[PDB]
Write an enzyme that holds these catalytic residues in place. Structure first.
Site, PDB file in Angstrom:
ATOM      1  N   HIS A 180       3.111   2.161 -33.935  1.00  0.00           N
ATOM      2  CA  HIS A 180       2.515   1.590 -33.520  1.00  0.00           C
ATOM      3  C   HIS A 180       3.945   0.909 -33.498  1.00  0.00           C
ATOM      4  O   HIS A 180       5.711   1.433 -33.602  1.00  0.00           O
ATOM      5  CB  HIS A 180       1.587   0.415 -33.937  1.00  0.00           C
TER       6      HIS A 180
ATOM      7  N   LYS B 223       4.552 -12.638 -35.984  1.00  0.00           N
ATOM      8  CA  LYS B 223       4.636 -11.092 -36.205  1.00  0.00           C
ATOM      9  C   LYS B 223       5.917 -10.696 -36.633  1.00  0.00           C
ATOM     10  O   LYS B 223       6.820 -11.702 -36.312  1.00  0.00           O
ATOM     11  CB  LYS B 223       4.652 -10.733 -34.734  1.00  0.00           C
ATOM     12  CG  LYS B 223       4.448  -9.548 -34.458  1.00  0.00           C
ATOM     13  CD  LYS B 223       4.731  -8.747 -32.615  1.00  0.00           C
ATOM     14  CE  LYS B 223       4.398  -7.194 -32.899  1.00  0.00           C
ATOM     15  NZ  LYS B 223       3.231  -6.880 -33.111  1.00  0.00           N
TER      16      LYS B 223
ATOM     17  N   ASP C 102       1.525  -3.014 -18.764  1.00  0.00           N
ATOM     18  CA  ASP C 102       0.412  -3.503 -19.486  1.00  0.00           C
ATOM     19  C   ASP C 102      -0.870  -4.561 -19.104  1.00  0.00           C
ATOM     20  O   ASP C 102      -1.419  -4.608 -19.924  1.00  0.00           O
ATOM     21  CB  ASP C 102       0.943  -2.964 -20.745  1.00  0.00           C
ATOM     22  CG  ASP C 102      -0.715  -2.477 -21.685  1.00  0.00           C
ATOM     23  OD1 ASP C 102      -0.265  -2.344 -23.125  1.00  0.00           O
ATOM     24  OD2 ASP C 102      -1.469  -1.899 -21.006  1.00  0.00           O
TER      25      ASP C 102
ATOM     26  N   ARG D 276      -7.489  -6.926 -22.514  1.00  0.00           N
ATOM     27  CA  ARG D 276      -7.242  -6.545 -23.888  1.00  0.00           C
ATOM     28  C   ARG D 276      -5.824  -7.095 -24.314  1.00  0.00           C
ATOM     29  O   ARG D 276      -5.231  -7.594 -25.274  1.00  0.00           O
ATOM     30  CB  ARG D 276      -7.461  -5.188 -24.147  1.00  0.00           C
ATOM     31  CG  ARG D 276      -6.013  -3.721 -23.440  1.00  0.00           C
ATOM     32  CD  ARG D 276      -5.969  -2.839 -24.139  1.00  0.00           C
ATOM     33  NE  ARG D 276      -4.824  -1.400 -23.574  1.00  0.00           N
ATOM     34  CZ  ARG D 276      -5.041  -1.279 -22.104  1.00  0.00           C
ATOM     35  NH1 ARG D 276      -6.507  -1.031 -21.975  1.00  0.00           N
ATOM     36  NH2 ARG D 276      -4.273  -0.809 -21.333  1.00  0.00           N
ATOM     37  N   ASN D 277      -5.096  -7.128 -23.079  1.00  0.00           N
ATOM     38  CA  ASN D 277      -3.801  -7.528 -23.377  1.00  0.00           C
ATOM     39  C   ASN D 277      -3.907  -8.941 -22.475  1.00  0.00           C
ATOM     40  O   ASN D 277      -2.013 -10.095 -22.567  1.00  0.00           O
ATOM     41  CB  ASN D 277      -2.364  -7.240 -23.017  1.00  0.00           C
ATOM     42  CG  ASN D 277      -1.873  -5.768 -23.462  1.00  0.00           C
ATOM     43  OD1 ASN D 277      -2.598  -6.037 -24.373  1.00  0.00           O
ATOM     44  ND2 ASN D 277      -1.624  -5.329 -22.716  1.00  0.00           N
TER      45      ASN D 277
ATOM     46  N   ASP E  20       1.089  -9.257 -24.646  1.00  0.00           N
ATOM     47  CA  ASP E  20       1.877  -8.863 -24.471  1.00  0.00           C
ATOM     48  C   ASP E  20       3.158  -8.735 -24.399  1.00  0.00           C
ATOM     49  O   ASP E  20       3.840  -7.896 -23.052  1.00  0.00           O
ATOM     50  CB  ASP E  20       0.890  -7.372 -23.908  1.00  0.00           C
ATOM     51  CG  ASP E  20       1.455  -6.178 -24.442  1.00  0.00           C
ATOM     52  OD1 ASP E  20       1.517  -5.464 -25.575  1.00  0.00           O
ATOM     53  OD2 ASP E  20       1.499  -4.514 -23.288  1.00  0.00           O
TER      54      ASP E  20
HETATM   55  C1  LIG Z   1     -17.422 -13.914 -33.756  1.00  0.00           C
HETATM   56  C2  LIG Z   1     -15.913 -12.695 -33.043  1.00  0.00           C
HETATM   57  N1  LIG Z   1     -14.487 -13.207 -32.685  1.00  0.00           N
HETATM   58  C3  LIG Z   1     -14.220 -14.551 -32.082  1.00  0.00           C
HETATM   59  C4  LIG Z   1     -13.264 -14.857 -32.242  1.00  0.00           C
HETATM   60  C5  LIG Z   1     -12.425 -13.888 -32.591  1.00  0.00           C
HETATM   61  C6  LIG Z   1     -10.648 -14.424 -31.549  1.00  0.00           C
HETATM   62  C7  LIG Z   1      -9.455 -15.107 -33.242  1.00  0.00           C
HETATM   63  N2  LIG Z   1      -8.541 -15.874 -32.503  1.00  0.00           N
HETATM   64  C8  LIG Z   1      -7.255 -14.956 -32.161  1.00  0.00           C
HETATM   65  O1  LIG Z   1      -7.177 -13.668 -32.712  1.00  0.00           O
HETATM   66  N3  LIG Z   1      -6.420 -15.045 -31.839  1.00  0.00           N
HETATM   67  C9  LIG Z   1      -4.928 -14.811 -31.986  1.00  0.00           C
HETATM   68  N4  LIG Z   1      -3.652 -15.481 -31.506  1.00  0.00           N
HETATM   69  C10 LIG Z   1      -3.200 -14.247 -31.637  1.00  0.00           C
HETATM   70  C11 LIG Z   1      -1.292 -15.129 -30.530  1.00  0.00           C
HETATM   71  C12 LIG Z   1      -0.478 -13.673 -30.273  1.00  0.00           C
HETATM   72  C13 LIG Z   1      -0.131 -12.956 -30.906  1.00  0.00           C
HETATM   73  S1  LIG Z   1       0.733 -11.381 -30.556  1.00  0.00           S
HETATM   74  C14 LIG Z   1       0.375 -10.444 -29.344  1.00  0.00           C
HETATM   75  N5  LIG Z   1       0.823 -10.521 -28.523  1.00  0.00           N
HETATM   76  N6  LIG Z   1      -0.339 -10.429 -27.594  1.00  0.00           N
HETATM   77  C15 LIG Z   1      -0.895  -9.775 -27.956  1.00  0.00           C
HETATM   78  C16 LIG Z   1      -1.873  -8.466 -27.375  1.00  0.00           C
HETATM   79  C17 LIG Z   1      -3.217  -8.254 -28.580  1.00  0.00           C
HETATM   80  C18 LIG Z   1      -2.417  -8.573 -30.175  1.00  0.00           C
HETATM   81  C19 LIG Z   1      -3.498  -7.570 -30.828  1.00  0.00           C
HETATM   82  C20 LIG Z   1      -4.531  -6.892 -30.460  1.00  0.00           C
HETATM   83  C21 LIG Z   1      -4.930  -6.733 -31.771  1.00  0.00           C
HETATM   84  C22 LIG Z   1      -4.539  -7.402 -32.768  1.00  0.00           C
HETATM   85  S2  LIG Z   1      -3.789  -8.616 -32.388  1.00  0.00           S
HETATM   86  N7  LIG Z   1      -2.032  -9.138 -30.148  1.00  0.00           N
HETATM   87  N8  LIG Z   1      -1.073  -9.863 -29.036  1.00  0.00           N
HETATM   88  C23 LIG Z   1      -1.811 -12.124 -31.842  1.00  0.00           C
HETATM   89  C24 LIG Z   1      -2.978 -13.185 -31.942  1.00  0.00           C
HETATM   90  S3  LIG Z   1      -5.100 -13.276 -32.138  1.00  0.00           S
HETATM   91  C25 LIG Z   1     -12.043 -12.976 -33.569  1.00  0.00           C
HETATM   92  C26 LIG Z   1     -13.810 -12.933 -33.747  1.00  0.00           C
END
Ligand SMILES: CCN1CCC(CCNC(=O)Nc2nc3ccc(Sc4nnc5ccc(-c6cccs6)nn45)cc3s2)CC1
Ligand SMILES: [Cl-]
Length: 284
Positions: free
Chosen positions: A30, A50, A138, A142-143, A156
């Site tokens: 990754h 990041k 992609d 999920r993205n 993503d």
């Molecule tokens: C109760 C269950 N549940 C309810 C709420 C839930 C969400 C909390 N909110 C966040 O997690 N927000 C967030 N904002 C951002 C903004 C930018 C980035 S970088 C990025 N750019 N493209 C992508 C595509 C994928 C990913 C990832 C996949 C796995 C780990 S990162 N990252 N990514 C990551 C996050 S993560 C947690 C618990």
């Protein structure tokens, strides 16, 4: 050592205000790792920071070039880059996280209207990216991310582009079950192959995040499709929306609708719903 023209060109992207990175609060790993953060300017903004590996002066040159390119992209349905700074990529934190987990959550009660609404916002974000000649490669639920207002943002993107999951990627990223027939055979991507992926994303929305082709192994998808098969219509997918998905999967890339046509057609379907139809998860 760096190109001085590039140093002046990256200034509007670089952040000094100031930033507090919460290094003990990790999001994902990754490539590099994502952490929680706080920005400034007399206000506190929650962000996802990041931190990329340890990257030669040519690697630094690319990092600064990418930052400028990324900053030039602005749309409410595309995840914005707040700025750059180890190389730091600062992105707005999305309260509700990724679209796939959001719809899969059994405590959430989306309606047909809400789900079509999320598909419409994704189409608007993609309509913007295509106009900028940006091929995503992609696009998947999920993205895509959701903010506090439930605004869907296509993610993503650029410096944030990564491989966070593995079961959806055959081992350059190959999200086989979201890929257009011609991309599976040439490993080449276009806006019309992003249109195929969008049709799959609409299927994910209407099934509340079911894995596509569950009884088909990744390596078997191109043979499966060439037999004359498509994803079946979800129980809560309206007939005009299923017709839209089938058009996204037209065997001829040039006969697929543009994202501008998708925004238009989906806005009409979305307008007919009032939020009285609750979408339930399938047992299979
Ligand atoms: C109760 C269950 N549940 C309810 C709420 C839930 C969400 C909390 N909110 C966040 O997690 N927000 C967030 N904002 C951002 C903004 C930018 C980035 S970088 C990025 N750019 N493209 C992508 C595509 C994928 C990913 C990832 C996949 C796995 C780990 S990162 N990252 N990514 C990551 C996050 S993560 C947690 C618990
Ligand atoms: Cl509804």
């Amino acid at each position: 050592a760096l190109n001085p023209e590039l140093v002046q060109a990256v200034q509007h992207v670089v952040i000094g205000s100031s930033l507090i990175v919460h290094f003990n609060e990790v999001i994902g790993r990754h490539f590099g790792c994502v952490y929680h953060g706080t920005l400034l300017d007399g206000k506190k903004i929650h962000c996802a920071v990041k931190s990329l590996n340890r990257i030669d002066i040519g690697e630094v040159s690319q990092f600064l070039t990418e930052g400028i390119i990324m900053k030039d992209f602005s749309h409410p349905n595309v995840l914005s880059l707040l700025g750059i700074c180890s190389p730091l990529v600062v992105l707005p934190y999305m309260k509700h996280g990724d679209l796939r987990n959001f719809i899969r959550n059994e405590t959430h009660n989306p309606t047909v209207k809400d789900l079509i609404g999320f598909g419409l916002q994704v189409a608007k974000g993609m309509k913007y990216l295509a106009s900028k000649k940006f091929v995503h490669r992609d696009l998947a639920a999920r993205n895509c991310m959701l903010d506090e207002k439930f605004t869907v943002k296509v993610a993503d993107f650029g410096l944030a582009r990564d491989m966070h999951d593995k079961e959806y990627y055959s081992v350059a990223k190959l999200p086989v079950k979201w890929m257009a027939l011609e991309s599976l055979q040439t490993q080449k991507f276009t806006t019309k192959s992003d249109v195929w992926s969008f049709g799959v994303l609409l299927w994910e929305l209407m099934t509340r995040g079911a894995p596509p082709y569950p009884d088909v192994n990744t390596f078997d998808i191109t043979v499966y499709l060439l037999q004359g098969r498509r994803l079946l219509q979800p129980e809560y997918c309206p007939d005009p929306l299923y017709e839209v998905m089938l058009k996204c999967w037209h065997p001829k890339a040039e006969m697929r609708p543009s994202f501008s046509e998708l925004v238009s057609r989906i806005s009409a379907i979305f307008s007919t719903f009032i939020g009285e139809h609750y979408v339930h998860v399938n047992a299979t």
